[PDB]
Design goal:
Order of helices and strands of chain A: HHHHH
Bound molecules: sodium ion
Number of helices of chain A: 5
Protein name (chain B): Bcl-2-associated transcription factor 1
Helix content of chain A: 40-55%
Strand content of chain A: under 5%
Distance between the termini of chain A: 44 Å
Radius of gyration of chain A: 15 Å
Oligomer: heterodimer
Subcellular location (chain B): Cytoplasm; Nucleus; Nucleus speckle; Nucleus, Nucleoplasm
Organism (chain B): Homo sapiens
Function (chain B): Death-promoting transcriptional repressor. May be involved in cyclin-D1/CCND1 mRNA stability through the SNARP complex which associates with both the 3'end of the CCND1 gene and its mRNA.
Family (chain B): Belongs to the BCLAF1/THRAP3 family.
């Protein structure tokens, strides 16, 4: 079965809204979310619907852009690196679980190319 | 095999 999704709410976690986090939502998330290959990454992997009974036996730090979107919109993060790490965890999980050349891997690679381009232009913290 | 196969 599916585990509980990653936390998007935690009142005693300290939160910030920085210019870098604003960029991560307005530029980085927005660019990847609208892409034709975004759909497998817009919500947690559903191991039941996709018939992947081993997915969460293997992937112990799941992450997806639906979770990231919620974290950004609900000001879950303290800094940009936390969010950047979530994106990189999402990509790494996909490359670890799946085989090279699979459709899902080609989709992640295209999203990751855009992610890297946008992260290269991350503004200096103000 | 494949995720969607
Ligand atoms: Na706070």
């Amino acid at each position: 079965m599916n585990p509980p999704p990653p936390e998007t709410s935690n009142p005693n976690k300290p939160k910030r809204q920085t210019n870098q986090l604003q960029y991560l939502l307005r530029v980085v998330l927005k660019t990847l979310w609208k892409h034709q290959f975004a759909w497998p990454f817009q919500q947690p992997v559903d191991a039941v619907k996709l018939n992947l009974p081993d997915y969460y036996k293997i992937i112990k730090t799941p992450m997806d852009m639906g979770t990231i979107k919620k974290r950004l919109e609900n000001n879950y993060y303290w800094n940009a690196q936390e969010c950047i790490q979530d994106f990189n965890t999402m990509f790494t999980n996909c490359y670890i679980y799946n085989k090279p050349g699979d459709d899902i891997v080609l989709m992640a690679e295209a999203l990751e190319k855009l992610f890297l381009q946008k992260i290269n232009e991350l503004p200096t913290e103000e | 095999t494949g995720k969607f196969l």
